[PDB]
């Protein structure tokens, strides 16, 4: 090579960032090809190319040209390609490209062009592709367009064109593709398009238009029609009457709202058919003469029925996507063996009946979700062998069938409230996923099985009490307690002949700590009776009366033993203050307090399962709750009365028979803090995302801890009180008499 | 100031006609323009202070303007068309013949 740009042996020259600001200059006389691109050249001279005629190609790409004398490119009769993009010449040279009369590509796209001159393109008889795509042009040059008969592929894109005449493409009859997209338009003329008989593909996108072109059933060749991302409203019967081999339609991102039925029919080339949000349409449409549908998707619509012959007719069919809509009944599904994915979601439809989805061989995929389902055939499933995901939750749901279900790695059942059946891990050999409504149906199962609903230690799989120890320990307190009030009440009501103050809320304090043992022999009796079961018996117990009994009675001992201590604090106070007739009084705040405790017991009854939360029952879960606000308020209000008792005897000793059973109220309140002051303030810790706990500490601590109290009051009360010991002699005496 | 340009060929006021401006590495702008019936187009920044005198029998042209700016530093150029006057023209596209110019300073 001559010159310093280097040169392939078969006579071509490739220069790129040599830097030159001319023509090569002692290049071979004869020469096919020329690539001088990324250069730095802007103006072109007096016949600069004639050194070359036998030229066939040639490349100035990214030049930044501004100017081209009008005999530069004369001589170059053998021209073939010619590209000039990304320059600064800003209107297609007229004069220049009138110099040739041979090249068939020619290209100048992507560099600003303002005005096309209107005998611009005269003379070139041979040219084949026009690129101006990404210019600032804004109305499809006719004259210069009628000029040359003979061009194939034509792109105007990236421009501002805003509307196009009519017969704006009528001389050009040997087009095949036509590119407006990334424009303005938005009004398209009825009769612009007619002539290109042989345009395949159109590509109408990221325009403005407002309303459906009625100009493309004037071309009839059509393959492909893009025309998306467009305001476009509605779509007309007979839209696409003029076109029978489109084979692709791009409508999506249109805000549709109605789509008449006799728009996509006798389209027999169609493959995939996609509409969204159709709100207006309310029937399915009428698509017969579309025989090779691969893909159909109504999404968002307003149609209640599909068409009993809609599979058996689209044979070719593989996916079938009607969501969002409104169906009540499914057709007969058989007669189509290629239906790989279905999904009815968000639909009205309420049962499966046992031939809706018989006879698909290829099925995979089944999405039935936020339906009205109540009821699916044993045999639904059984046809169908091949289906991997399974997708029926949010339902109403009371039973599931296990037949041909084997095979399917995901299940999915959540908010099937109503399904409290057990599902046997024998009928899914294989599944690698699963969800169900209740976490007792998943403590069934377990290259491992995942299962939404955790089983985290306080939904039990085996045992509900859990560690030998801690049974054994509540099995001791539930005893202990039961005997030790039945005892201490059963003193104060013989030894009654006066009945002062302080022993009545002493004996009612011990009355109400006797339904804290009796819930503890509830849980105590029914951890017995499920023993290593407590996967089938957790489904009832929670979903069931059983769980409200329990919670009622566990939340009424707590807050009468609490509201009974204020006042026998209050009571203790007055006394000491001190025919009085307070202690009527006294009775009837008692009277009050068991009625306000009966109150908060029954609260959590009546709102949305505050008692189901855990198998003890206790409104105190593990992290997240039904009602936050309940345990908030409990918890304070409990913590609060505990703050005034411990004032008022803090103004007693600062004061200073009477002062006799001042030190056991002053035990009962030390005790009955540290039994429940520790436990509150750990339950208000999983609120607290610093300080973090094992489920099984927390349910472990809970359970030991909550009766703790209702085990000690009586026994502390029993072992230390002259006043005791006395009433027993009492009962002796009467049990003698 | 005054300058003229010399047409060797036969006069071409019966078509596209006018005056061009070069500034050292961008593109060529046309500031006067001679059409049929004398017609004259002028460019944004050419009203009053640049303007343009044509002639048939002479066979040349004239540019006068008024008060310089050196801002108006160029190599000026005369060029004419000939054949299918499509249109009035302020672009170079639709110029076919070009004249060796003159360097205004």
């Known amino acids: 090579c001559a010159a310093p740009c280097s040169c392939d042996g078969d006579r071509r020259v490739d220069c790129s960032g040599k830097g030159l600001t001319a023509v090569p200059e002692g290049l071979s006389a004869f020469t096919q090809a020329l690539d001088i691109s990324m250069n730095n050249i802007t103006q072109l001279p007096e016949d600069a190319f004639k050194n070359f005629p036998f030229l066939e190609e040639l490349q100035l790409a990214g030049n930044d040209l501004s100017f081209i004398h009008p005999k530069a490119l004369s001589g170059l009769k053998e021209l073939k390609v010619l590209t000039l993009q990304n320059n600064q010449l800003k209107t297609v040279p007229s004069e220049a490209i009138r110099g040739l009369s041979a090249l068939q590509s020619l290209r100048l796209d992507a560099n600003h062009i303002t005005s096309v001159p209107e005998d611009s393109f005269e003379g070139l008889v041979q040219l084949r592709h026009l690129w101006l795509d990404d210019n600032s042009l804004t109305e499809v040059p006719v004259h210069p367009l009628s000029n040359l008969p003979t061009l194939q592929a034509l792109t105007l894109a990236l421009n501002k064109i805003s509307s196009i005449p009519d017969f704006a493409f009528t001389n050009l009859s040997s087009l095949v593709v036509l590119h407006l997209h990334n424009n303005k338009i938005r009004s398209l003329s009825q009769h612009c398009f007619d002539g290109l008989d042989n345009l395949e593909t159109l590509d109408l996108n990221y325009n403005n238009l407002g309303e459906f072109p009625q100009a493309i059933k004037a071309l009839p060749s059509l393959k492909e029609l893009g025309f998306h991302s467009n305001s476009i409203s509605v779509i007309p019967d007979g839209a696409f009457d003029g076109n029978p081999l489109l084979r692709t339609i791009h409508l999506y991102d249109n805000p549709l709202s109605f789509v008449g039925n006799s728009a996509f029919h006798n389209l027999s080339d169609l493959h995939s058919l996609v509409i969204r949000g159709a709100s207006m349409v309310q029937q399915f449409p009428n698509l017969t003469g579309t025989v090779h549908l691969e893909s159909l998707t109504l999404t968002g619509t307003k149609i209640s029925s599909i068409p009993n012959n809609l599979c058996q007719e689209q044979k070719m069919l593989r996916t079938l996507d009607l969501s969002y809509n409104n169906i009540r009944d499914l057709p007969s599904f058989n007669g189509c063996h290629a239906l790989e994915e279905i999904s009815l979601q968000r639909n009205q439809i309420y049962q499966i009946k046992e031939g809706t989805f018989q006879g698909l061989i290829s099925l995979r995929i089944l999405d039935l979700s936020r339906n009205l389902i109540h009821e699916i055939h044993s045999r639904a499933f059984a046809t169908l062998g091949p289906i991997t995901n399974l997708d029926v939750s949010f339902n109403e749901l009371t039973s599931f069938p296990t037949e041909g279900l084997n095979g399917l790695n995901q299940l999915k059942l959540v908010g099937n409230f109503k399904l409290k059946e057990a599902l046997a891990a024998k009928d899914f050999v294989n599944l690698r996923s699963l969800s169900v409504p209740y976490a007792y149906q998943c403590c069934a199962f377990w290259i491992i099985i995942h299962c939404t609903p955790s089983t985290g230690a306080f939904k039990p799989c085996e045992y509900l009490l859990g560690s030998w120890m801690i049974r054994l320990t509540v099995w001791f307190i539930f005893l202990v307690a039961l005997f030790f009030n039945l005892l201490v009440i059963l003193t104060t009501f013989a030894s009654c002949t006066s009945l002062p103050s302080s022993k009545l809320f002493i004996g009612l304090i011990s009355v109400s700590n006797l339904f804290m043992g009796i819930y503890t022999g509830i849980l105590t009796f029914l951890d017995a009776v499920s023993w290593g079961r407590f996967a089938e018996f957790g489904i009832w117990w929670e979903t069931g009366s059983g769980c409200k009994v329990a919670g009622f009675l566990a939340v009424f001992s707590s807050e009468s033993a609490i509201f009974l201590l204020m006042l026998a604090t209050v009571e203790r106070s007055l006394s000491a203050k001190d025919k009085s007739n307070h202690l009527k009084q006294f009775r009837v705040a008692a009277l009050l307090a068991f009625l306000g405790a009966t109150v908060a017991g029954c609260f959590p009854l009546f709102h949305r399962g505050e008692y189901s939360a855990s198998p003890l029952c206790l409104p105190f879960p593990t992290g997240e709750t039904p009602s936050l606000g309940f345990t908030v308020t409990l918890v304070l209000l409990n913590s609060l009365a505990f703050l005034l008792m411990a004032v008022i005897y803090t103004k007693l000793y600062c004061n200073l028979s009477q002062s006799s059973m001042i030190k056991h109220v002053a035990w009962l309140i030390f005790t009955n803090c540290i039994f429940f002051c520790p436990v509150a303030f750990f339950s208000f810790a999983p609120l607290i995302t610093a300080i973090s706990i094992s489920p099984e500490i927390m349910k472990s601590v809970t359970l030991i801890f909550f009766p703790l109290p209702a085990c000690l009051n009586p026994v502390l009360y029993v072992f230390f009180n002259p006043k005791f010991k006395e009433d027993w002699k009492l009962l002796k005496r009467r049990v003698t008499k | 100031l005054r300058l003229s340009c010399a047409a060797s060929?036969?006069?071409?006021?019966?078509?596209?006609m006018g005056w061009f401006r070069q500034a050292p590495g961008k593109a060529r702008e046309g500031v006067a323009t001679?059409?049929?019936?004398?017609?004259?187009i002028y460019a944004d920044s050419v009203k009053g202070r640049f303007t343009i005198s044509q002639d048939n029998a002479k066979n040349t042209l004239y540019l006068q303007m008024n008060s310089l700016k050196p801002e108006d530093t160029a190599m000026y150029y005369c060029?004419?068309?000939?054949?299918?006057?499509?249109?009035?023209?302020?672009?170079?596209?639709?110029?076919?013949?070009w004249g060796q110019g003159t360097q205004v300073t």
């Open positions: 060029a004419s068309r000939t054949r299918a006057g499509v249109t009035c023209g302020l672009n170079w596209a639709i110029f076919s013949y």
């Open positions: 060929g036969y006069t071409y006021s019966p078509y596209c």
């Open positions: 001679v059409d049929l019936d004398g017609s004259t």
